[PDB]
RNA sequence: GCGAAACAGUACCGUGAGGGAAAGGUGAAAAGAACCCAGAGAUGGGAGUGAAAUAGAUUCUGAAACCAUAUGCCUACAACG
RNA sequence: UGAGUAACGCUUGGGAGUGAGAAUCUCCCAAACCGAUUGACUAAGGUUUCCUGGACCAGGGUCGUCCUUCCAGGGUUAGUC
């Protein structure tokens, strides 16, 4: 099955309407204060107090 | 599958050389309609 | 014979440099160009190129060169006469020296 | 005062780097460069470089303060495509178009740009009412 | 005996392995033309120790800078190994 | 000493880098 | 430093395109719909 | 306009005979953008040359289709060549 | 336009390293398939596709610091095959 008629410019756009991204939700490191991606370690290896992986 | 070429340079060189096409009079007339088209390739002998 | 050959003191008689008196280091016949010292004076950015024993320094800022000009604008330049002007030159043959001269056409001047 | 830069030749295609600008525009400095580094797309470590360099040569070249720059337009024009050949089955062949995308970044310090483009529009379309005035008056001088 | 049958030597890793430990072996490009016994002969009239031994190598031609605006091929070559008798070890430059 | 700092990178046309001749490197590159 | 060329030619972004013949030797067959 | 203004009977297609394209224009002069900034770099923004750099090698002029941005107006109970 | 849709054409995990950037590159440890074969020698054909170093315009159905891609250099030795 195929389109037997064409598509607008309107129609394509309506459609596109519901594909817009969402921004992800960022916070502030404790010791470095960079934003970095909720829940997660910062670049220096810092999350809360706990010192998890080598410095970048 | 055996598809229609198969390459060999005897075979290649036997039917659409040089000197098979210098050996009749029809293979004579290619080779003077190809000199009219001025064709740098004039034969499979050439790369 | 040729107007304009390798010495001979020149002008420029049109363009941005009007009396622009120099002397002709070289001339391209095949282009109809001529290079005369101290005047179309150009400065190509030179950049740094190391490739080469003289290309590990090849020092070159802003150096000012001497760009060609077309034959047409130069026009030859008279000495021997006191009121020194500008004119066309003839192709008289003396037969002195059976030698090809040149002589100016509003004066008796040689070369 | 618009400061820019550009970028010709984008890998990314117009249609997906689009959703990435409308992330951007109109935001500040710091938050536009802190939302485009953590978002997992392709276009979007190329709009940041992009975004970088226009700062650095707004606070550079066009000498502005840096603490009241906001992105004024982030667009990705269509570039030239390039053009190939897919083979396909039973011996047809199709064309495939890989997308390139002309990028380019404006950041303002006035929150007001906007009134001096449409004045400039405005400046533009007085001198065409002014060009026929004169025009007519000459006719019945004449 | 006319010697335009010997063209030019070549120095590489391989040329530089024969041309040392006891027995040189000095590598040369020919003539393609030539035959062994006329590089024998070139090398007796320009150098005059006779060889022990002669190799001949035949490269194809083949294309060189595939892509570039004008693609172009190579050169046809004929290599010549020559090599000398135990200590004996004559300059190729400097006659 | 010399020859050391010489033979650093420095290709000659038919050899590679490591291997340059202990005695030969002042002919073409002179 | 000793970042130049003195070569005639030379170029890192080599000149190139991709050309198509459009080949489309496509074809087709008979059927099972046939109302005779 | 000769198929061919460019290196065209070329690239390419076919075992072969044979078939057979597209592609021109910087600036008067390369004077082809030293240098600084961001970037890994290309590149971009300044600086400089130039009458002109929105003439920058993507190089005469640059139309529409086509793709985006915005001033203003309208539009989420509505049957629409 | 269809539409960012179908498709991306049989093979895993981790450690270390390079790099501006590593699921894809290098090394190591495993793991899984071939094993009358995905093993080894050659004929035909292909014609440098072979080795080293460098590069990531273009191509690799993703990525790429990597490639059978590109650049530079080099490589095929017969009285007995
Ligand atoms: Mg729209
Ligand atoms: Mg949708
Ligand atoms: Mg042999
Ligand atoms: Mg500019
Ligand atoms: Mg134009
Ligand atoms: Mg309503
Ligand atoms: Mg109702
Ligand atoms: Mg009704
Ligand atoms: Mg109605
Ligand atoms: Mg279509
Ligand atoms: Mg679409
Ligand atoms: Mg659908
Ligand atoms: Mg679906
Ligand atoms: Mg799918
Ligand atoms: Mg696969
Ligand atoms: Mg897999
Ligand atoms: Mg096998
Ligand atoms: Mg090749
Ligand atoms: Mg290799
Ligand atoms: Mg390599
Ligand atoms: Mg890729
Ligand atoms: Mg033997
Ligand atoms: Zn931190």
């Given at each position: 099955?195929?389109?037997?008629?064409?598509?607008?410019?309107?129609?394509?756009?309506?459609?596109?309407?519901?594909?817009?991204?969402?921004?992800?939700?960022?916070?502030?490191?404790?010791?470095?204060?960079?934003?970095?991606?909720?829940?997660?370690?910062?670049?220096?290896?810092?999350?809360?107090?706990?010192?998890?992986?080598?410095?970048? | 599958?055996?598809?229609?070429?198969?390459?060999?340079?005897?075979?290649?060189?036997?039917?659409?050389?040089?000197?098979?096409?210098?050996?009749?009079?029809?293979?004579?007339?290619?080779?003077?309609?190809?000199?009219?088209?001025?064709?740098?390739?004039?034969?499979?002998?050439?790369? | 014979?040729?107007?304009?050959?390798?010495?001979?003191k020149v002008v420029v008689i049109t363009g941005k440099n009007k009396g622009?008196?120099?002397?002709?280091?070289?001339?391209?016949?095949?282009?109809?160009?001529?290079?005369?010292?101290?005047?179309?004076?150009?400065?190509?950015?030179?950049?740094?190129?190391?490739?080469?024993?003289?290309?590990?320094?090849?020092?070159?800022?802003?150096?000012?060169?001497?760009?060609?000009?077309?034959?047409?604008?130069?026009?030859?330049?008279?000495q021997k006469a006191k009121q020194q002007t500008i004119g066309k030159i003839?192709?008289?043959?003396?037969?002195?020296?059976?030698?090809?001269?040149?002589?100016?056409?509003?004066?008796?001047?040689?070369? | 005062?618009?400061?820019?830069?550009?970028?010709?030749?984008?890998?990314?295609?117009?249609?997906?780097?689009?959703?990435?600008?409308?992330?951007?525009?109109?935001?500040?400095?710091?938050?536009?460069?802190?939302?485009?580094?953590?978002?997992?797309?392709?276009?979007?470590?190329?709009?940041?470089?992009?975004?970088?360099?226009?700062?650095?040569?707004?606070?550079?070249?066009?000498?502005?303060?840096?603490?009241?720059?906001?992105?004024?337009?982030?667009?990705?024009?269509?570039?030239?495509?390039?053009?190939?050949?897919?083979?396909?089955?039973?011996?047809?062949?199709?064309?495939?178009?890989?997308?390139?995308?002309?990028?380019?970044?404006?950041?303002?310090?006035?929150?007001?740009?906007?009134?001096?483009?449409?004045?400039?529009?405005?400046?533009?379309?007085?001198?065409?009412?002014?060009?026929?005035?004169?025009?007519?008056?000459?006719?019945?001088?004449? | 005996?006319?010697?335009?049958?010997?063209?030019?030597?070549?120095?590489?890793?391989?040329?530089?392995?024969?041309?040392?430990?006891?027995?040189?072996?000095?590598?040369?490009?020919?003539?393609?033309?030539?035959?062994?016994?006329?590089?024998?002969?070139?090398?007796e009239l320009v150098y005059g120790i006779k060889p022990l031994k002669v190799?001949?190598?035949?490269?194809?031609?083949?294309?060189?800078?595939?892509?570039?605006?004008?693609?172009?091929?190579?050169?046809?070559?004929?290599?010549?190994?020559?090599?000398?008798?135990?200590?004996?070890?004559?300059?190729?430059?400097?006659? | 000493?010399?020859?050391?700092?010489?033979?650093?990178?420095?290709?000659?046309?038919?050899?590679?880098?490591?291997?340059?001749?202990?005695?030969?490197?002042?002919?073409?590159?002179? | 430093?000793?970042?130049?060329?003195?070569?005639?030619?030379?170029?890192?972004?080599?000149?190139?395109?991709?050309?198509?013949?459009?080949?489309?030797?496509?074809?087709?067959?008979?059927?099972?719909?046939?109302?005779?």
């Amino acid at each position: 099955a195929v389109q037997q008629r064409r598509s607008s410019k309107h129609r394509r756009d309506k459609r596109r309407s519901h594909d817009a991204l969402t921004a992800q939700a960022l916070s502030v490191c404790q010791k470095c204060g960079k934003k970095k991606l909720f829940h997660r370690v910062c670049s220096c290896g810092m999350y809360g107090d706990l010192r998890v992986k080598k410095a970048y | 599958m055996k598809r229609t070429y198969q390459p060999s340079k005897l075979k290649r060189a036997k039917t659409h050389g040089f000197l098979a096409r210098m050996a009749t009079a029809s293979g004579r007339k290619v080779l003077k309609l190809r000199r009219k088209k001025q064709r740098a390739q004039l034969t499979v002998s050439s790369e | 014979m040729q107007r304009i050959k390798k010495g001979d003191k020149v002008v420029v008689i049109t363009g941005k440099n009007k009396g622009g008196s120099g002397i002709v280091l070289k001339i391209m016949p095949a282009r109809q160009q001529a290079i005369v010292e101290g005047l179309n004076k150009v400065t190509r950015h030179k950049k740094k190129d190391q490739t080469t024993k003289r290309a590990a320094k090849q020092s070159t800022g802003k150096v000012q060169q001497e760009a060609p000009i077309f034959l047409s604008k130069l026009a030859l330049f008279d000495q021997k006469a006191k009121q020194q002007t500008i004119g066309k030159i003839k192709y008289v043959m003396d037969p002195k020296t059976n030698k090809k001269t040149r002589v100016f056409k509003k004066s008796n001047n040689t070369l | 005062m618009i400061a820019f830069a550009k970028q010709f030749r984008v890998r990314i295609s117009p249609q997906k780097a689009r959703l990435v600008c409308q992330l951007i525009v109109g935001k500040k400095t710091a938050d536009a460069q802190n939302i485009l580094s953590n978002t997992p797309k392709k276009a979007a470590t190329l709009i940041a470089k992009l975004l970088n360099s226009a700062i650095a040569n707004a606070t550079n070249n066009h000498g502005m303060n840096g603490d009241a720059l906001y992105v004024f337009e982030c667009v990705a024009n269509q570039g030239p495509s390039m053009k190939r050949t897919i083979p396909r089955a039973k011996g047809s062949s199709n064309m495939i178009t890989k997308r390139s995308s002309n990028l380019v970044v404006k950041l303002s310090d006035n929150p007001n740009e906007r009134q001096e483009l449409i004045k400039q529009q405005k400046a533009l379309v007085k001198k065409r009412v002014e060009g026929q005035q004169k025009a007519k008056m000459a006719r019945q001088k004449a | 005996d006319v010697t335009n049958v010997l063209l030019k030597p070549v120095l590489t890793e391989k040329v530089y392995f024969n041309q040392m430990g006891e027995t040189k072996k000095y590598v040369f490009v020919v003539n393609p033309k030539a035959s062994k016994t006329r590089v024998k002969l070139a090398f007796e009239l320009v150098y005059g120790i006779k060889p022990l031994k002669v190799n001949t190598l035949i490269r194809k031609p083949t294309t060189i800078r595939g892509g570039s605006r004008f693609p172009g091929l190579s050169k046809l070559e004929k290599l010549a190994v020559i090599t000398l008798p135990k200590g004996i070890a004559i300059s190729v430059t400097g006659e | 000493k010399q020859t050391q700092d010489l033979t650093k990178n420095m290709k000659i046309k038919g050899f590679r880098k490591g291997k340059v001749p202990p005695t030969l490197a002042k002919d073409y590159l002179d | 430093x000793x970042x130049x060329x003195x070569x005639x030619x030379x170029x890192x972004x080599x000149x190139x395109x991709x050309x198509x013949x459009x080949x489309x030797x496509x074809x087709x067959x008979x059927x099972x719909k046939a109302a005779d």
